[PDB]
Design a protein around this nucleic acid. Structure first.
Ligand SMILES: C/C=C\C=C\[C@@H]1O[C@](O)([C@H](CC)C(=O)NC/C=C\C=C(/C)[C@@H](OC)[C@@H](C)[C@@H]2O[C@H](/C=C/C=C/C=C(\C)C(=O)c3c(O)cc[nH]c3=O)[C@H](O)[C@@H]2O)[C@H](O)[C@H](O)C1(C)C
Ligand SMILES: Nc1nc2c(ncn2[C@@H]2O[C@H](COP(=O)(O)OP(=O)(O)O)[C@@H](O)[C@H]2O)c(=O)[nH]1
Length: 371
RNA sequence: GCUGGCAAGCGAAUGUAAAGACUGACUAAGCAUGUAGUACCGAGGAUGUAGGAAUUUCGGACGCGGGUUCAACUCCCGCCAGCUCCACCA
């Protein structure tokens, strides 16, 4: 809160969701150190590339942390698959790539650690070919993707070769990730993802601005679980730096006045007044396929109670279908009505995720609202 | 049925009552194929192998949902209702 941030080199979000205990934290720390040297839980570090300013999100690679990882990847603009070159693909890596494809991460860069732990020039190529084949078979891009090999912990050790290699890694990261599209057309909207309580400052809510801008001193409305209320913003900041306005697409922390830590939970949205209204039941078309798209095999019936993940959080919901469909067997391209317990401010065209038993069943697009 | 040959009175003895074949227009009365009928049932005949009565039970409900030992009413998971532990300072 002592640095006046300059809105140059537009913000781009990059997230590392690589394999567990394969060097994600070490890799991001090494990247930050080498960039700050040559240029002068979800860990949100930042670094200013000469091309663009990036915010690096090291997400937890644990399966049980998938719920917050969903927002971390939806938050994310470019994925970094961090994997060891001595073990190759893993079930955890496959789950992570499936989640990334289901959340819609366009650009992914593969990094191969433990390059020097292997005294050969064929095993590294074999594992690179294997991961490339995995990407090409799991609906991912192919030979037009920069694949990065090298050591993630020696990048911090005194060297020159690996420093140059990681600098080249950062270069094509910023090359392969062009200027992203921002949605500052509609009024301001920001889904909440974390809450902090600053002693002497107050409560601050973190998140990626979905749309619109936030000027210092603007009135906004909290809409979400069990509550729709009003508030005032004072002191827009980003990564402990002074800001003047907050564009859309970057993870920022907005300071709210008259906010209670227990009263405000994750799942709500800070919108412009009179824009969106929370609803508990709405009509949506489902896009489940027969068997090979996450959906189950046996022809289940009504009363299904899945979690409907949204931009922020999820909630257990019920589904009702119009007459003409005796069963709700997988293969549901039809429209139905979904009722949720916790009301969340929603708009037409919203894309949500249907999940159950730790696996995604199908997608859904909001068609109408029944309040 | 009027008549039909005549006895019987015109108010007397007092009546055999078969009704199928054959020609053809057939789409019964333009118009597709005909000599007995493929229709229509309703108290005329039959199904009784399967669905209705009893009779063994499958179905359910211990929070729901389902991929689970079927013996599930906690044999595998995601939630939600409480207890605890921390991560958690734009
Ligand atoms: C994943 C949960 C959270 C997502 C959040 C929301 O997802 C979304 O609502 C999203 C809507 C598009 C959503 O609902 N996703 C969540 C739910 C739905 C899932 C989406 C997308 C899919 O389409 C039916 C999606 C995989 C789709 O398959 C296509 C190809 C198939 C790939 C293979 C893998 C699959 C499945 C598979 O079963 C499979 C296999 O076949 C062989 C081997 N092993 C496998 O395991 C293509 O790759 C498309 O991408 C939006 O992206 C929102 O922006 C969001 C981020 C708020
Ligand atoms: N030998 C070797 N070890 C590595 C390399 N990259 C990462 N590591 C190991 O990975 C560990 C760091 O794991 P960490 O990032 O904290 O786990 P994660 O966050 O779940 O990915 C370190 O102890 C390193 O020994 C590498 O290139 N070579």
């Amino acid at each position: 809160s002592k640095e006046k941030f300059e809105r140059t080199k537009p913000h781009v979000n990059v997230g590392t969701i690589g394999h567990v205990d394969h060097g994600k934290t070490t890799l991001t720390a090494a990247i930050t150190t080498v960039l700050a040297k040559t240029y002068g839980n979800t860990s949100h570090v930042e670094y200013d590339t000469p091309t663009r300013h990036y915010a690096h999100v090291d997400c937890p690679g644990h399966a049980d942390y998938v719920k917050n990882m969903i927002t971390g990847a939806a938050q994310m603009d470019g994925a970094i698959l961090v994997v060891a070159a001595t073990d190759g693909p893993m079930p955890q890596t496959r789950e992570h790539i499936l989640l990334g494809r289901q959340v819609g991460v366009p650009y992914i860069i593969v990094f191969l650690n433990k390059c020097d732990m292997v005294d050969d020039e064929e095993l590294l190529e074999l594992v690179e070919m294997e991961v490339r084949e995995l990407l090409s078979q799991y609906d991912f891009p192919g030979d037009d993707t920069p694949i990065v090999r090298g050591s993630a912990l020696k990048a911090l050790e005194g060297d020159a070769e690996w420093e140059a290699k990681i600098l080249e890694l950062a270069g094509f990261l910023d090359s392969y990730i062009p200027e992203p599209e921002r949605a500052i057309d509609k009024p301001f909207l920001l889904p909440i993802e974390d809450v902090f309580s600053i002693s002497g400052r107050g409560t601050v809510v973190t998140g990626r601005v979905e749309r619109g801008i936030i000027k210092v001193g603007e009135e906004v409305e909290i809409v979400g679980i069990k509550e729709t209320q009003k508030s005032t913003c004072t002191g827009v900041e980003m990564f402990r730096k002074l800001l003047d306005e907050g564009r859309a697409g970057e993870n920022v922390g907005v300071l709210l006045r008259g906010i209670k830590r227990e009263e405000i939970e994750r799942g709500q949205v800070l919108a412009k007044p009179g824009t969106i209204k929370p609803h508990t039941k709405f009509e949506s078309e489902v896009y489940i396929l027969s068997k090979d798209e996450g959906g189950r095999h046996t022809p289940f019936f009504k009363g299904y109670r899945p979690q409907f993940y949204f931009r922020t959080t999820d909630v257990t919901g019920t589904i009702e279908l119009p007459e003409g469909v005796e069963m709700v067997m997988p293969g549901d391209n039809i429209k139905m009505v979904v009722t949720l317990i916790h009301p969340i401010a929603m708009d037409d065209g919203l894309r949500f995720a249907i999940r159950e038993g730790g696996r995604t069943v199908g997608a859904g697009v909001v068609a109408k609202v029944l309040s």
